[PDB]
Design a protein around this ligand. Structure first.
Ligand code: NI
Length: 341
């Protein structure tokens, strides 16, 4: 059944709750972003109001074929009324179109639902600065102190420098980048920009990217693989067998592959710096795992929460085990005693 952490009390609303059939008592279904564990269940047969960003609404219409009459896109940073209740959508610094949602309950309670987010100090100057938030529905993906990772900027500088050096040393090297969802577009776009190429990809992935309102996108991507020396492939193909196979397909245009796998966290984060990352190599194929995250590190999460000072925290990730739930509740209490709220 629908878990309690997907329901907004005092309303008829749910958040990211599309796989339970008709949730009894739900008058509006909000969708924070277009990732499959969150939209799971939506299709052209859905006949309840969906509230989301413009970009998420473009993906719902073009990829899932949800009918236009049920898609209700809202502008960001704007007070809107939904079924009698004031709401605001805020940028979540996750993937394109991802939002956090502020609910102002008729009784005076204010609720923030982060969706998935990568906390940033810029959020401390949004509309959140303007009033107290009582309850926080928090993306706790990386809520443990082992999870450190570099800034997105540091990671993109590493990728751009690595690719440019390799292709300038060998003009017959191909660059390949893995993907299995929206998000992390800066990785392949920044590498293609330094190389003066468009990124080549499948018709399905091109259609997806054309929904994202990215400026000048027609100048940056293409379905013509032959004209491109940065290719995108399914993350599943980013291994030596899949890449050897891909190289055969390019008809002797290339004699070397340099590939990137933008993972979340991996245990080499506890020991190694970004300047010291090395690839896995077999023959003329090299694969780099780069720690490009679209979720909060532990320290970013802790700074946001100690700033916001909520009265109550409801985790939305890692909630399925008693050991994970107890660990998280211990950190929440530490943070509250340290900061004095
Ligand atoms: Ni997500």
């Amino acid at each position: 059944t629908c878990p309690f952490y997907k329901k907004i009390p005092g309303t008829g609303f749910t958040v990211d709750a599309f796989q339970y059939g008709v949730v009894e008592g739900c008058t509006a279904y909000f969708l924070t972003h277009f990732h499959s564990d969150h939209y799971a269940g939506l299709s052209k047969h859905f006949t309840f109001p969906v509230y989301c960003s413009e970009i998420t609404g473009n993906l719902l219409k073009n990829k899932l074929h949800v009918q236009e009459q049920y898609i209700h896109p809202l502008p960001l940073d704007t007070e809107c009324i939904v079924n009698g209740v004031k709401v605001v959508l805020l940028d979540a610094n996750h993937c394109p179109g991802a939002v956090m949602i502020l609910f102002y309950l008729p009784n005076g309670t204010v609720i923030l639902h982060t969706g998935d987010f990568r906390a940033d100090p810029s959020m401390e100057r949004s509309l959140l600065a303007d009033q107290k938030v009582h309850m926080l529905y928090l993306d706790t993906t990386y809520c443990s102190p082992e999870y450190t990772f570099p800034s997105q900027q540091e990671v993109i500088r590493f990728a751009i420098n690595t690719a440019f050096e390799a292709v300038t040393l060998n003009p017959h090297a191909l660059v390949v980048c893995g993907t299995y969802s929206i998000g992390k577009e800066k990785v392949f776009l920044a590498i293609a920009d330094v190389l003066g190429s468009k990124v080549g990809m499948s018709q399905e992935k091109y259609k997806t990217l054309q929904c994202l309102n990215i400026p000048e996108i027609n100048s940056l991507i293409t379905t013509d693989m032959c004209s491109s020396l940065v290719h995108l492939l399914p993350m599943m193909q980013i291994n030596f067998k899949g890449l050897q196979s891909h190289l055969k397909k390019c008809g002797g245009k290339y004699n070397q592959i340099l590939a990137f796998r933008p993972t979340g966290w991996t245990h080499s984060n506890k020991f190694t710096r970004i300047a010291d990352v090395i690839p896995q190599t077999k023959g003329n194929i090299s694969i780099y795992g780069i720690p490009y995250s679209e979720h909060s590190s532990y320290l970013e999460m802790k700074r946001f929460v100690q700033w916001l000072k909520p009265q109550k925290i409801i985790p939305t990730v890692n909630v399925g085990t008693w050991k994970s739930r107890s660990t998280m509740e211990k950190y929440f209490r530490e943070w509250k005693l340290e900061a004095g709220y």
